[PDB]
Ligand binder design. Structure first.
Ligand code: FES
Ligand code: MG
Lengths: 112, 225, 135, 26, 215, 100
């Protein structure tokens, strides 16, 4: 839940400070890359699957971005296309269609 | 002590008045006629349950009696305004791909929800499995088009009847208004008519929400003193 | 919580009966609004039976007295060069002008249809309206 | 009750049936 | 917790599949009712009997009818309906008459909350057809209040135990009609030969009115 | 004193048009998909007309054109179809651009 995510964020901040203390670096300038290097040094793992090695990333990345329930206490969903079951995809399609309509109003090499 | 007065003075206050939100101002028979609301399909496509709402055929072209349409639209708009005033979830449904963008945009602007895409099986009867048991089903569903793309009745009508969700609906001469809670006989293919319906529903919902906010603020202010 | 028997009664009847039976602890949000402002017809599911025999739909055909004049005019002249601007609610077609002149002349007291037609055509020709015949 | 109500009559615009080329001929 | 579940039939349906040939499955018809007029029924198919029971009852609890009961103990009027090939003739009965009905009807009536009723089942005794025809007939019955509202007249009950005292059980909520209902000397109704034969006493049966356990 | 629905229907230009066969109407191109133009002419349904081989680029959204109407609604009843089957569009012939 959202409160669980807040608790995880607080725990991650405290752990980041503790890891900066352990590695003897400034907690205020301890980037995510420093966190990863410190974790790899303190908890070495030769497992080939990188997703299986120890990780202490931000909760925004460790937890799936599917988020908690998509409605508040009142139960009203936040997104107006929620009942489509694919609110992200259909919102993206709606935005693209609006862009095409605006293009109608007004009027390959290094990418895949 | 808060609830005993809150519930009455907010929820039950509009129920005493016939037209609390003055939805009759929004539309007129002249306005509906100008929006080509009265036009219907040919007599061959006519659905028999729509016969009471058909004024007559003009050269094998059914005309929808706007006198009955006015009363039905009054009832439907009043019901929608009351549901919005009670902060109920309002879901527009229309599989007509022509107006999908407009309907979705209107729903987003009015603060309510839209479903103009392929209605997956069990989006209502199986909502607890597809969303989690804590999901809150819509308290009112508004069909701007009650027929799917194969001209069968939209499955959402039957599903909403199954889940006891009232349905406001724009029924054309070929539609089936049996299970629609608040049928509104009218043209659903003319862009002008669909735009008129969208404007009326958006205005009713917005007026209802604004009136709810004003009444809540007034009640909270007076209760403190 | 609720009956999915959409073929039995209406949502209002089912909900009210379940509330009376105590199955539904609390009324749904829409219930009070429905009770205060019920629709004209209770939404009860009905099977659309097919007609047979002498039974016939009561839908009438929208005919007016001016329809005869319009048919005669379109037979004699047909669609003129002036197209129909149906987007204009105040539009008056050439056939509509002919019908108006015919009604004016009928109000004068004339009764012969096939003579009033020629008189109306003469009056419109004096007015300058193009009245090319079909053949 | 009002003049604007439609009246009952045979279709005035009904075009005649396309008679066969020999119809009315012996 | 207010609802009780009762099994009406369990059947071992064998389906012929391409690989496994004859495959066993259980089809179970259950009825659930709270005893206060709210009841329903459902079918459940499964591989295990307990799964079928769970499915059937959890689905029947979502398909609840509401059976209006006269005085909370019996039906409002005599009913006679045919569902498919099953004829059900239910008779309203006074208090203490008990349930003299097909055992499935007895179970469903206990679930609904009907204490006094008669019921004869003729034709096919298909349990599912009988059950859903019974539910249809019970749901479609018209209450005294509905009758009074429809015809705009007082519904006056005459009881032999109460003598000639007229008891008003339902009065129309709208205007009351002034013109008396036409009193045809000969009503135009379709009687049952069984009922007429029983009333005249010619319905000799070594199986009718047999003493049976309390229902 | 408000005009009744019957009066509006009686005096409607669509009612005055009588039969829609071979009538001349002024429509507006409200949508373009390649060489297909969707024209609304005040009827219940629009009509799809191919872009003319001559002056085709001169037709754009909002261009007013002249149409010869064949039927407001294209419906047909097939074998065993209890109800008429419609394609939700009209049948008209695109004469060409209309100039005021
Ligand atoms: S069409 Fe009439 S005689 Fe042949
Ligand atoms: Mg339509």
């Amino acid at each position: 839940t959202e409160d669980f995510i807040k608790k995880q964020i607080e725990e991650f901040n405290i752990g980041k400070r503790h890891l900066a203390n352990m590695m003897g670096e400034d907690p205020e300038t301890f980037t995510q890359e420093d966190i990863d290097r410190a974790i790899a040094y303190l908890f070495p793992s030769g497992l080939f699957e990188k997703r299986a090695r120890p990780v202490m990333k931000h909760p925004e990345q460790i937890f799936p971005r599917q988020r908690a329930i998509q409605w508040g206490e009142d139960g009203r969903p936040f997104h107006y296309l929620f009942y489509t079951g694919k609110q992200s995809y259909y919102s993206l399609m709606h935005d693209v269609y609006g862009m095409l309509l605006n293009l109608e109003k007004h009027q390959v090499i290094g990418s895949r | 002590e808060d609830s005993t007065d809150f519930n009455d003075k907010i929820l039950n206050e509009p129920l005493k008045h016939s037209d609390f939100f003055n939805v009759k101002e929004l539309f007129s028979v002249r306005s509906l006629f100008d929006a080509r609301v009265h036009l219907g399909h040919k007599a061959g496509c006519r659905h028999r349950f729509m016969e009471p709402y058909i004024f007559g055929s003009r050269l094998d072209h059914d005309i929808i009696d706007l006198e009955q349409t006015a009363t039905h639209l009054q009832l439907a708009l009043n019901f929608t305004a009351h549901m919005a005033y009670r902060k109920g979830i309002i879901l527009f449904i229309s599989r007509n791909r022509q107006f999908s963008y407009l309907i979705e945009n209107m729903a987003r602007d009015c603060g309510e929800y839209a479903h103009t895409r392929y209605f997956r099986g069990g989006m209502l009867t199986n909502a607890r499995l597809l969303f989690g048991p804590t999901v809150r089903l819509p308290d009112l569903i508004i069909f701007l088009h009650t027929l799917n793309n194969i001209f069968e009745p939209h499955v959402a009508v039957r599903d909403a009847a199954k889940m006891n969700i009232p349905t406001v609906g724009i029924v054309d001469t070929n539609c089936n208004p049996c299970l629609i809670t608040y049928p509104v006989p009218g043209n659903d293919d003319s862009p002008l008519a669909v735009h008129l319906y969208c404007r009326l529903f958006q205005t009713a919902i917005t007026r209802a929400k604004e009136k709810r906010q004003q009444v809540e603020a007034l009640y909270r202010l007076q209760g403190q003193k | 919580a609720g009956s999915r028997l959409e073929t039995v009664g209406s949502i209002f009847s089912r909900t009210r009966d379940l509330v009376r039976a105590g199955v539904l602890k609390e009324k749904p949000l829409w219930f009070d609004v429905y009770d205060a402002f019920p629709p004209l017809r209770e939404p009860v599911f009905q099977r659309p039976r097919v007609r047979y025999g002498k039974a016939k739909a009561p839908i009438q055909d929208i005919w007016y007295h001016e329809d005869r004049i319009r048919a005669k005019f379109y037979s004699v002249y047909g669609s003129g060069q002036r197209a129909f601007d149906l987007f204009n609610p105040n539009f008056k077609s050439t056939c509509q002008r002919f019908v108006e002149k015919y009604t004016e002349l009928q109000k004068l007291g004339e009764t012969d249809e096939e003579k009033l037609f020629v008189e109306t055509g003469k009056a419109l020709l004096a007015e300058g309206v193009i009245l090319r015949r079909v053949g | 009750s009002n003049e604007d109500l439609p009246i009952s009559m045979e279709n005035p615009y009904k075009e005649p049936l396309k008679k066969c080329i020999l119809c009315g001929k012996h | 917790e207010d609802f009780d579940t009762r099994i009406l039939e369990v059947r071992n349906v064998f389906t012929m599949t391409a690989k496994e040939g004859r495959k066993k499955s259980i089809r179970v018809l259950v009825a659930v009712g709270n005893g206060k007029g709210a009841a329903g029924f459902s079918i459940g198919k499964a591989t295990d009997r307990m799964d079928a029971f769970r499915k059937a009852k959890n689905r029947a609890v979502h398909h609840l009818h509401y059976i209006e009961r006269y005085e909370d103990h019996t039906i409002f009027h005599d009913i006679s309906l045919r569902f498919k090939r099953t004829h059900i003739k239910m008779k309203k009965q006074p208090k203490g008459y008990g349930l003299r009905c097909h055992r499935a009807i007895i179970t469903i009536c206990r679930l609904i909350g009907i204490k006094d009723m008669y019921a004869k089942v003729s034709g096919s005794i298909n349990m599912l057809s009988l059950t859903q025809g019974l539910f249809r007939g019970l749901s479609r019955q018209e209450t005294h209040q509905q009758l009074a509202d429809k015809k705009g007249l007082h519904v006056v009950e005459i009881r032999e135990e109460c003598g000639p005292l007229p008891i008003v059980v339902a009065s129309p909520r709208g205007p009351l009609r002034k013109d008396p209902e036409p009193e045809d000397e000969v009503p135009d109704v379709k009687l049952d030969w069984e009922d007429v034969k029983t009333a005249q006493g010619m319905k000799r049966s070594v199986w009718s009115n047999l003493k049976r356990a309390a229902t | 004193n408000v005009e009744s629905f019957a009066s509006m229907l009686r005096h409607s230009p669509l009612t005055q048009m009588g039969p829609a066969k071979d009538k001349l109407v002024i429509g507006r191109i409200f949508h373009i998909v390649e060489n297909d133009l969707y024209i609304d002419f005040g009827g219940k349904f629009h009509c799809v007309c191919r872009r003319p081989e001559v002056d085709g680029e001169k037709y754009q959204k909002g261009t007013r054109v002249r149409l010869r109407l064949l039927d407001l609604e294209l419906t047909s009843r097939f074998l065993g179809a209890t109800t008429d089957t419609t394609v939700l569009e009209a049948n008209a012939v695109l004469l060409g651009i209309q100039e005021s």
